[PDB]
Symmetry: C4
Subunit: 276 residues, 4 copies
């Protein structure tokens, strides 16, 4: 099936007048480990602009200033602070780990803190280098509400499929190995969304998106969507994926390359349009 | 009674041609203690944009750079610098303490410095976590010109009323326990302004405001209003509260969520309109 | 005499096609000493936007990041670096010392470095707290091309005149004590420009300018003007002073307060208009 | 021959729909050594905005925050980190070394790391102070795809020609001393592009460009062009040079000075127009 605007218009519902906060969810982002700070800033920017009720960032000490230059709306702390990181996991509804996390000792220590602190009611998004980190180890998943957002090569690491042999049928079968509800966002030329026996295709998107930080922005948007829209999780993530490229398509008419932060700036205006 | 634009148009008076500075007041903001830096940046942004003559921020050493990235208009120093903090209290007309202050040892040391340095002619706004700090201790108030801006839960801590039993009559009676002139801004779904036997209701506002940092922006605006408008303090704070949501209402027509910093950017253009 | 647009249109000449750089001058700014960093950032912003060929800032180590967040166009270094500060003085055509300099030991050490390194062909602008620093000491001036930009109170310190007795005749007579070519910019409600027996009045300006950082922006603009326009120095500084308030007047139609950084952003568009 | 829009329209081709990333190249920038941080930020800004697929910056530790304030899209690390700098050279298609590099011990250590790590398939741009660094030493070039972007004075250092005797014929003959494919961009009043027996002249450009950071922006643009357009390297660099001044010409109609960062902001909109 094809993910289009009508699906996205189905998900992006006008906000209930009464319910204020909580309803719109709390996300914790974990990443931007040296030297990949910008990645967590771009996911943060996307997440806030998508309408997450509260956004909290666990990042490198020396990257907090730059984050706040862009986004004072998001609390940020040193990810090495083990007890605060723990407290913040329990306060979060959605945990996005991976953008700019890297693979050093601090990343593995952190991965393992998060992995032991995740609760069953929480949504866990595993992005970028955290896919490699998930691959090195294994048996019980701390939640069933798992979203994977790997690159062509990172998904290879997790599933054992080379880029030529990452055909729909092969990716689909490698998924039946993770919990049934697991959503996979196969970031690619044409990104596809997998869950169980469902495959979603986006027709929107173009070469103006082939620029550094595009995936981080996508990760942030998916996190913001799942935080506030509690209906079918596959369609919610699918909508996030559609809108990301749909905005890029709009910005392309007047831009040779569409920059990740330029897409983030446009998010609410377009979500507003999508809500009618 | 209902706080509307006509009241706000009554407060926001065209500026006297002669009187330059001083008239528009000096505010000291104290907060943005690690890791809640963004909060003091958002209150600062609101305070300057509301037209405070001079804005000074006592904040965490490592948060000054980020503040100045947004706002070189505001002097900022390390709140641990006891003698400078003291000097700055005596130079201020309005002291806004609390947004991002936190509750650690540095926050309590600071609370107590401010509390002993406040003078009777000064307006004191106690926000966020400083409400909890005020709650732990008590007998003489250093000023009668007190404004409280607590969340549903923080006001519980101060008054002993649960969120179900924070009914108008109960909040009103719990106020008769603080000095007669004390203004309470009950930040809520529908924020209400209390002083003595007066209750102000705003009809403006919506769910697009249910995003992190919204209260900090409100605290900054109230501080900027009270700094420059010296008529009835209840109506001045009420106007600040109205305009905050009124701007959010305007920005909502083209935004699914209205971000705290987006509201700040619009303040003077709208105050200009309000002044006619 | 009155400083108006016709004078400003006389100074702001269309740029010669051939002459590229050098012609437009090199300014060194010295200030933004802790905790007054924003001041040097606002003077820097004004100076670059006014069209200075090259702008260099000697500032506090911990303030360079914030400066570059606003203005990567300007080189910045630690003012404690004595040998680099010296080298940079000799490379500069115009030295603006004072905005946010403060009065501590580092400020006095620096004042005295600059004072001994100034050359006769250089223009020296002494601003803010550097007026107090000039007041404490005295006999030979390192240049005759001196511009003073003090506040009502700072000029008192230098001349011995109280704010009531800073009447035109008294200020004029206190100037005949500094070298003949010295220009005084008496920043006030209505700023006036003094040199010898000349007094310039600006009619433009309003109460929307009574906000923190307004003087720093003026200091930066004067520095940028004198760097590139080598005709009569009194009229050049006068034009800078006029345009500062003229821009504020334009921005006031849609702004209750006009912020110093908002004026800086508009400078070249308006200078372009002034050049015809 | 004259470099105009028709040449630039020939180079800036609409992006292939399929090919996503890699095609658009990876650039490593090395510079922004203390205190010339802004220079690498301005080259970075230009490089990303020109459409480089991935941009990585090797810069001073204390300059990474400021870079990310402007550009979270670009990874940045401490250039003193020898093993990471090495790894990043091998991952890059284009290496731009020099803007703000300075000439101290750290710059020479770095120059020599890069010089030994460059591979034959890589394009190497030597800018600003790195021209002086290239001049001090000499015999085998690590690549034939060399672009030199020196100032009037830096090219003197390399070739032994004074500014009066840097006549077309003299510059042309001094080039026959570097590998045959070497491109020289003679940044000047009227910048000219040299390769072999070819000389390109731009007619666009004006005095509004005579402002600090203009060359850094040019260096960044050339880097972004060569990263994505793999046809004739002389024409590709020529186009980059044309567009830089062409944009400045457009911005000049409403700007007395055209600032380097203002040009960068406009790049994709204009490249989009150039692609038709
Ligand atoms: K809808
Ligand atoms: K009015
Ligand atoms: K003119
Ligand atoms: K074309």
């Amino acid at each position: 099936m094809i993910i289009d605007d009508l699906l996205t218009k189905k998900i992006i519902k006008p906000r209930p007048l009464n319910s204020h906060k909580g309803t719109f969810g709390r996300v914790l982002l974990i990443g931007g480990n040296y030297p990949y700070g910008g990645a967590i800033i771009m996911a943060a920017l996307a997440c806030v602009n998508s309408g997450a009720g509260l956004v909290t960032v666990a990042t490198h000490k020396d990257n907090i200033t730059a984050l706040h230059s862009h986004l004072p709306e998001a609390m940020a702390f040193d990810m090495v602070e083990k007890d605060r990181l723990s407290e913040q996991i329990t306060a979060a509804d959605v945990v996005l780990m991976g953008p700019g996390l890297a693979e050093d000792d601090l990343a593995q220590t952190t991965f393992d803190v998060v992995w032991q602190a995740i609760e069953p009611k929480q949504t866990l998004i595993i992005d970028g280098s955290a896919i490699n980190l998930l691959a090195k180890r294994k048996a019980i998943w701390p939640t069933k509400q798992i979203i994977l957002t790997p690159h062509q090569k990172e998904w290879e690491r997790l599933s054992g499929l080379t880029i030529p042999e990452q055909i729909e049928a092969a990716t689909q079968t490698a998924l039946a190995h993770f919990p049934k509800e697991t959503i996979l966002v196969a970031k690619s030329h044409q990104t596809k969304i997998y869950q169980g026996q469902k495959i979603g295709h986006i027709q929107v998107g173009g070469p103006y998106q082939a620029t550094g930080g595009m995936g981080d922005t996508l990760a942030g948007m998916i996190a913001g969507f799942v935080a506030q829209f509690h209906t079918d999780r596959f369609e919610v993530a699918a909508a996030a994926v559609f809108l990301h490229s749909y905005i890029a398509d709009q910005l392309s008419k007047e831009a040779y390359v569409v920059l990740p932060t330029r897409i983030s700036a446009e998010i609410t205006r377009v979500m507003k349009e999508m809500s009618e």
